[PDB]
Amino acid sequence: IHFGNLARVRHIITYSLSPFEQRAIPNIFSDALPNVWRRFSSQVFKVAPPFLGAYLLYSWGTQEFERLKRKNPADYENDQ
């Protein structure tokens, strides 16, 4: 038994329709997509900043490593 002995619940009425009486993907532009933006809006200031900052470290780390391959012309400036 896992259904029946779960929780003691009172005074809750729920209403639902058959899947065949309703749309599967309803209100794409009136309700769905406006929330898709809302969910992106709320989290992007938590998710993106460390990833953005991580890329910066990568961009510097790569460039600096490449710069250390090039030669410093001041080494030979008096070499004859």
Binding site: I1, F3, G4, N5, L6, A7, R8, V9, R10, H11, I12, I13, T14, Y15, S16, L17, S18, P19, F20, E21
Partner: protein, 295 residues
Amino acid sequence: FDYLHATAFQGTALARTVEGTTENIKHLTRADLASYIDTHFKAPRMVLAAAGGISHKELVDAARQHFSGVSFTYKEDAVPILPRCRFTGSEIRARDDALPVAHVALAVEGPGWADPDNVVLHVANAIIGRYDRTFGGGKHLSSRLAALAVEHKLCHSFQTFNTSYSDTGLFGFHFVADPLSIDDMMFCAQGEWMRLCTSTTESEVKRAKNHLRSAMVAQLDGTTPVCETIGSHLLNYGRRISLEEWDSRISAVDARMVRDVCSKYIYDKCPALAAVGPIEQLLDYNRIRSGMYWI
């Protein structure tokens, strides 16, 4: 049963309770009441029925005297054609775990008073029948659902109904069970529904017809139940259907017909579900919906 109507015919007039809202009872006026009476209690929509030691001619004479003057316009003659009510494959679950036992009603849309299929649906409903823990027959009852209900202690009671209305109806069943016997009860109940559409034998309906015959005759035991039949037969059929005629319709019912009629109104149809009380074991409309096909 109020909840069943409230969700089966949700958004229509049939979804309303007979007694009405609390607010309506609170605020209904003498004008509102008098309006209802004048609007609805009109001669063509009324039937003066009688049954007993009464001369019919004497009846229509006393009726001719006290049932009064003629309507003037054509509006007051015509009988209104009610707007149709939309069925909805849906559910309503009013949960209360403190409630001792749970109630569950499941139904599909009926045909209406006019349809001759309403006879077959009553034959089919007779097969499954009904039960409550005082049925002395016990485990030996002919009804399969009743036998399974006894063998496995599935419910306190279960009943099948074919409530017909003017243009629609409600073919289904209702049972009362303990919090942990609901799912198994619903399982077996839906199984017998499929058994109707699929496996119904001539032996089964030969019994069911005999029960329905004895039922309609028992329906007319007294003057009031005869008057009730008469007052309703005219109001719904437009005429009186003698027991002789009922028998002719019923006696023509065979197993092949019960299968067809049931497959028409039950099989792969989105049912209406009303569940009240401690109702955890019974869950998900989709599971109930999948119980509507393949025995």
